[PDB]
Symmetry: C2
Subunit: 398 residues, 2 copies
C-alpha cells in the first residue's frame, strides 16, 4: 500500500540532498585504450581512417561533450600518432578545456572548408580508406565528397565494437545515474495524489534529478495515466490522475554523459483483475528475459524468452496485441539507445560488460499498457541488474 | 538602471499571465503548400524522390514533432500521390495523434528492414533519383545504399528552398515566441540584484516562459556575469560593476525565439561602455545592410566594417568578432541562411535570421546583442527592437 501517495512536496524535498556516492570520471588512460581498440577494429575492417562527429561517439573517444551542430567538430583517427581534432578556430579555447585525449588540432575559420582539412589530414598519413560515424549528419558525406573520391565505409561496427562492452568505470557512472533516477521514481510515486497533473510529475522529476546532481536534470520524462499507458511512446496532452488508473513513468538522467532509463508502471487506488493479471505477466516476462542472459547467448534469444512467457499466457504470438509490439530492449551507455538491441533477428552474442534495457511492455489495445524497465549488464557468468525489478502492482520498488 | 534591478519576484509574477495574443497554428492547407513547393524544387533539380528524416524537417512537412532516434521515421515524397510515411508499426497510434498531412503509412516491424520499404515505394512510382535529407544520420545513407545502385543526392537545396522563406503564419508564430521571450528578458533584468545566482536567473527564465505559455519553458538559457561573458562557449553570483549576458528563447508551435541581452549591473567602465556602444553600432549596420538581393556575406561584412573602422579586428581577430554575424532561424534554432563570409546566398523576402555580431575582449568581457529580423520587400523588420544603452536593455 505504502509507496504510492501520501508524501508531500516538502517531505520529498527532504530526501533530495546532492548525491554523495560519486563515481570517478573516465581517466586519461581509458581514453587511450578506447583509441587503441578502435585501431584494432579499423585494421580488422581494412580501414585506415575513422571520422567521429560531435555527439556521444566524440565524447567517448575524446571527452568533448558538445552536441552536434551545423559546424563540423570531429576527430579523425588514423593508424598512428595523436588523432586530429577538426574544430572551428573561435572554439579553440573551449575545446582545450574539455579535451581528455592529446590531439593535433586543425582549426577552420567560419568561411573555410572543414572537409578539406579532413582530407588533407588523410593525405598526410597516406590514409585512403575512410570510415564515417553513422551518427554524423549526411551533410558530412556531401562535404567529404567534394574532396574524397574513395569509398566511405560506415563506422558502425568499429564504434559498437568499442562502446558495446562497458569498462568498470563506465558501469559505475551508469550505476550512479540509475540509483539517482530510482530514488526520483520512488519519490514521484510518493507525491502522487488524486488530481495531480502529468506535467506536475514531469516538473517534479526534473527538479529532483537536478537537486541530486544529474548533469542536466531529466534527460527525458514520460508520464502517462490510464488509457494513455497503451501507447508505448505516448500521446500529447496533460492528464489528471484518478483512482483506478495505472501510472507509467519513464525517465532518466546522465552522470558524466552515462544514462539511466527506468520505467515504472503502478496502480493508483484499487486495480482491476485485468490490470493485475497483465502487470504480473509483465514482471514475469521481464524475469525470463533476464534469466536468459549470459555470455554467448544471441540477443534475439533474450527477446524470444520474453515472448515465450507472453505466449504461454495466451498473448502474442510475435508482435500481436494484446502482447509485446516492440523489441525487448536496447543497449545503453553514452546514448539512451545504442547497440546491442534485444530484438528478433539480432544474432549478436552477448559479452561481459554489455549493457541493455529489459522492458518487454504489454499493450492491451483500447485499455492500458504495462511497461517495467530496468537495465542490466552482462557478467562473466550471467547478468546483474543495475536496479532491482518491481515487486507488485502496488509495490513499484523492491 | 530603472530597467535593471528593483523588481520583486512577485512584481515580476504579476506580468506573467498566459499570453493572450496567440498566433494561429499551421493549418492543413499550408502543409500541402510546403509539399507542393518541395515537388517543384525536386523537378527543378531533376530529383524524383525525397526522403526526410524525423526532426525539424519532418515537422515542417508533416507536423510530426519527434526527435530522430535509431529507428527510421521518415517521409518519402515522390512526384505524385500522397507522401509515404515510413514508421515503426508499434508507434502507429502515437503517429496518428500528431500527423497534420495525409500520408500513406508504410509500417515496419522491429526485425524488418525499413530501408527496403523506402526503395519499394520508390520502385512503385518508378523513382530512381533520390535526394536525402542532409540533416539525417549517415546510417540512413548506409541502409539506403544497401538497396540502391543509383546516386543518393543531398536534399539541402530542396529543403532550404522551402524553409528559408517564412509564410505569414510562420512569421506570426516566431513573433509570438519573440514577444514572450523579450518580456522574460526584461523581467529577468528587473529581478536581478547583488548576489543573485546564474542558476536562479535560469530557473526564473524557465518558470516565466512556462507561465506565458511557451511549448516547453525555456528552449535553452545561457546567463554569464563579468569575465565569463568573454568565454561565450564556457554557477556565479552577481557583483556591482559586472556585465550580465543572457541568451534565451522558447518555442511556440515549434517556432523559435533566440534573444541575447547584455547589460551592466552597477557602474560600467569606459572600456565596457565603448565596446557596448560598438556592439549596438555593428548590429545596426548589419541590419541597415538587409534588403532583397543582398548577399548574406555582405551583412556579416557590414558588422565587421564597423568594428574595423573603430580599430578592432580585422577579420576574426580579437578584440573583435571571432565568428559569423548570425544564423537563419525557424523550426531549428540554427538553419539557413547563415550571415557568414563566403555565403553568396541573396537574401529574399520572408527569410529570418539573427543579428548578433558579438564582440569578445579576451580575458576581460564580451558583449552580445542578439535580435532577429525578417526580410521584407524593401528591407528588413526586427522581430524585437534592439537595445538602447548599456543600462537600457529594452527599447
Ligand atoms: Zn525508458
Ligand atoms: Zn529504454
Ligand atoms: Zn542566442
Ligand atoms: Zn542566435
Amino acid at each position: 500500500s505504502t509507496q504510492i501517495g501520501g508524501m508531500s512536496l516538502d517531505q520529498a524535498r527532504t530526501q533530495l540532498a546532492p548525491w554523495t556516492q560519486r563515481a570517478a570520471p573516465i581517466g586519461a588512460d581509458e581514453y587511450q585504450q578506447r583509441i587503441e581498440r578502435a585501431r584494432v577494429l579499423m585494421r580488422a575492417q581494412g580501414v585506415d581512417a575513422l571520422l567521429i562527429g560531435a555527439g556521444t561517439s566524440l565524447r567517448y573517444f575524446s571527452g568533448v561533450p558538445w552536441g552536434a551542430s551545423e559546424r563540423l567538430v570531429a576527430l579523425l583517427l588514423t593508424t598512428e600518432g595523436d588523432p586530429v581534432l577538426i574544430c572551428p578556430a573561435f572554439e579553440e579555447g573551449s575545446l582545450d578545456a574539455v579535451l581528455q585525449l592529446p590531439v593535433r588540432k586543425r582549426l577552420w575559420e567560419e568561411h573555410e572548408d572543414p572537409y578539406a582539412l579532413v582530407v588533407q589530414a588523410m593525405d598526410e598519413q597516406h590514409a585512403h580508406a575512410l570510415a564515417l560515424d553513422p551518427g554524423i549528419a549526411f551533410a558530412v558525406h556531401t562535404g567529404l565528397r567534394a574532396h574524397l573520391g574513395t569509398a566511405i565505409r560506415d563506422a558502425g561496427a568499429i564504434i559498437d565494437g568499442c562502446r558495446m562492452c562497458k569498462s568498470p568505470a563506465e558501469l559505475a557512472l551508469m550505476q550512479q545515474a540509475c540509483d539517482m533516477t530510482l530514488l526520483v521514481q520512488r519519490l514521484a510515486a510518493g507525491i502522487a495524489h488524486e488530481g495531480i497533473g502529468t506535467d506536475q510529475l514531469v516538473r517534479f522529476i526534473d527538479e529532483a534529478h537536478r537537486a541530486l546532481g544529474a548533469d542536466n536534470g531529466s534527460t527525458f520524462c514520460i508520464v502517462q495515466f490510464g488509457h494513455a499507458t497503451a501507447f508505448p511512446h505516448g500521446i500529447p496532452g496533460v492528464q489528471h490522475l484518478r483512482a483506478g488508473e495505472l501510472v507509467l513513468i519513464d525517465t532518466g538522467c546522465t552522470v558524466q554523459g552515462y544514462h539511466s532509463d527506468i520505467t515504472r508502471t503502478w496502480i493508483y487506488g484499487t486495480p482491476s483483475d485485468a490490470q493485475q493479471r497483465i502487470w504480473e505477466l509483465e514482471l514475469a516476462a521481464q524475469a525470463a528475459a533476464f534469466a536468459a542472459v549470459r555470455p554467448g547467448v544471441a540477443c534475439e534469444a533474450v527477446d524470444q524468452a520474453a515472448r515465450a512467457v507472453l505466449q504461454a499466457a495466451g498473448l502474442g504470438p510475435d508482435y500481436r496485441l494484446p502482447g509485446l509490439p516492440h523489441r525487448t530492449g536496447h543497449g545503453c551507455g553514452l546514448a539512451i539507445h545504442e547497440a546491442p538491441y534485444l530484438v528478433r533477428g539480432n544474432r549478436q552474442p552477448l559479452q561481459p560488460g554489455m549493457c541493455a534495457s529489459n522492458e518487454p511492455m504489454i499493450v492491451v489495445p483500447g485499455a492500458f499498457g504495462v511497461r517495467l524497465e530496468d537495465h542490466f549488464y552482462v557478467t562473466d557468468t550471467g547478468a546483474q541488474w543495475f536496479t532491482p525489478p518491481s515487486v507488485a502492482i502496488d509495490q513499484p520498488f523492491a
